[PDB]
Amino acid sequence: VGMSLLALISIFASCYMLVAARSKCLTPYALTPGAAVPWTLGILCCAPRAHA
């Protein structure tokens, strides 16, 4: 149970960082403009999961 609980917490933490990184890098591009470098800089920088 301890090993499984540790495994989940790290996965949850890792998922937590990924979403946070998406928010930090997506908010600047999407404040006034809809412009997100169609996956040229959408993949390397952060999550390209923005709709656009």
Binding site: V37, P38, W39, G42, I43
Partner: protein
């Protein structure tokens, strides 16, 4: 009388199974490449 349990199905890594493995892998890679190309195409269209 036969002195072997009548098991005829071959085992992977055999010449017969290797060839289908070879052909199956090539088609799978071709399908995978097409999937990747389509994903990139739809990708660059969205963002």
């Amino acid at each position: 009388a036969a002195s072997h349990s009548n098991v005829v199905f071959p085992d992977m890594s055999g010449t017969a199974l290797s060839w289908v493995q070879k052909i199956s892998g090539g088609l799978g890679a071709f399908a995978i490449g097409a999937i990747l190309v389509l994903v990139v195409v739809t990708c660059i269209g969205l963002r």
